[PDB]
Amino acid sequence: GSHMASMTGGQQMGRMEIFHTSPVEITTINTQGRFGEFLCFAADEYVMTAGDHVTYRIKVDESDIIMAGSIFYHERAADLSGLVERVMQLTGCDEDTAEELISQRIDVFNLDDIDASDAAELSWEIQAITAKAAKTLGFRGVSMQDEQGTCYMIDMLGHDAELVRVK
């Protein structure tokens, strides 16, 4: 069975070669992210910082973040009540930041307001909790603010052949 996704008919709109990082050697997906959830990729050559890690270059719909980013239109509307209590207790974030934080629109790396020392370690947890959002829609389409300024968290499906080492 399977091999059906490989025989796709141009269903995936616009693929983007992305740098997924997990310090290892290419054998199995470590799937050990901060949420036990999907894997991180960074934009540009800044896969982590330097390329001393086994990075994977995968092809991904640029549309993924667009159809997933639709979350940031509906969630605050109805889910607000639960969201407020949620992210407030998740990483001690004020509702203003909290709401936008769902789609990870601000890591403490760009933030001078909140103490970017302690909140920095919490921002890794923000990345974990943002994967929870990506876990809900099915399209993972989520982005962060890293050294280069945008990271993304996407699912490492059993199509693992997609993960091509780029160090």
Side-chain angles (χ1 to χ4, degrees):
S2 59
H3 302 109
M4 294 297 174
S6 185
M7 296 181 298
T8 178
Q11 313 172 271
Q12 307 184 214
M13 303 178 180
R15 262 59 62 80
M16 141 174 51
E17 286 78 73
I18 61 183
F19 295 98
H20 273 273
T21 51
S22 186
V24 82
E25 305 168 279
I26 288 68
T27 49
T28 184
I29 299 303
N30 299 91
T31 186
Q32 194 188 271
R34 184 46 179 213
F35 196 49
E37 212 45 87
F38 322 112
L39 215 107
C40 308
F41 105 70
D44 198 80
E45 314 303 293
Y46 281 106
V47 312
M48 298 193 65
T49 47
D52 293 308
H53 295 91
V54 296
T55 306
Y56 327 112
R57 173 181 288 155
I58 115 178
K59 297 76 205 179
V60 79
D61 301 43
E62 303 177 88
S63 309
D64 191 59
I65 179 170
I66 307 179
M67 54 183 172
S70 306
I71 184 180
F72 191 55
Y73 189 68
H74 68 251
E75 89 285 67
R76 296 175 61 191
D79 303 282
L80 181 64
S81 305
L83 282 167
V84 172
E85 296 158 72
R86 175 59 172 192
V87 33
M88 185 281 177
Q89 294 181 269
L90 297 185
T91 41
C93 302
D94 290 274
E95 303 90 280
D96 183 87
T97 313
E99 291 184 75
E100 102 182 278
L101 199 68
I102 267 61
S103 303
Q104 247 292 31
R105 252 67 209 104
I106 171 59
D107 282 283
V108 74
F109 182 70
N110 191 86
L111 216 56
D112 182 75
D113 182 82
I114 306 176
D115 297 271
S117 188
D118 296 78
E121 72 169 280
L122 268 61
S123 294
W124 292 111
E125 309 208 282
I126 297 175
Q127 149 190 92
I129 68 180
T130 203
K132 189 277 192 299
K135 187 186 183 66
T136 305
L137 283 70
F139 316 115
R140 316 304 174 189
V142 65
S143 42
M144 309 79 228
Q145 295 181 329
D146 77 291
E147 301 296 290
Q148 204 274 93
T150 322
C151 204
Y152 295 76
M153 300 189 61
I154 342 224
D155 182 38
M156 239 73 285
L157 297 79
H159 59 47
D160 65 272
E162 288 288 276
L163 296 312
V164 194
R165 169 161 57 164
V166 268
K167 53 180 175 184

